[PDB]
Every structure is written in C-alpha cells, then in structure tokens.
C-alpha cells in the first residue's frame, strides 16, 4: 500500500482522477490509466490557510 500527500486548490480536485488534463494533472502529479486504489479529499481551510 502506498500513500501520497499534497495540498491543492478546491477547483483542481477533479483533475486528480485518471485521464484528466490541466496545469496540475500534467505538470505535478498524473495518475496512470489503469490505476487501482482511490483518493480522498477534504477541506482544510482552518489550518493551511
């Protein structure tokens, strides 16, 4: 099992899904086509901001 942690903007959460393209899914972190597993996202306005 592997775990990857990073902080992004709310609008780009949809790009982390496999196959999406954009400034974050093509330049920082791109998932493979046959990805097995899944992702978890939650708002963190209190601490990081």
């Amino acid at each position: 099992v592997y775990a990857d942690s990073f902080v992004i903007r709310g609008d780009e959460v949809r790009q982390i899904a496999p196959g999406q393209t954009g400034n974050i899914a093509d330049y920082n972190y791109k998932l493979p086509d046959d990805f097995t597993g899944c992702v978890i996202a939650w708002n963190s306005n209190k601490l990081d901001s």
Partner: protein, 49 residues
C-alpha cells in the same frame, strides 16, 4: 480515444470489437453451408463422368 476519458474509453472500444467479431462469424458460418452444397454437387459430377 480523443472524445472520451481514458478511464472508460476501453469499455467502448471493446463494445465495438464485439460487432466486428460477430459480423466476421456470420460470414464464416454462411460459407460452411454453401461449401457443403457445392461438395454435394462436385460428388455428382464425378459420378456423371
């Protein structure tokens, strides 16, 4: 490929391979019927000669 997401494009492409494989199957089956009919007629010309 250029109009669907890569996560689910593989579902549609195999959904198209089935038609191009079934269509080739019906052609072969029809020939097997015709070949037996010609075979029964080539065995009559051999007797007639």
């Amino acid at each position: 490929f250029s109009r669907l997401d890569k996560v689910e494009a593989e579902v549609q492409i195999d959904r198209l391979i089935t038609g191009r494989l079934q269509s080739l199957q019906t052609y072969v089956t029809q020939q097997l019927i015709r070949a037996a009919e010609i075979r029964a007629s080539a065995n009559l010309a051999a007797t007639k000669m």
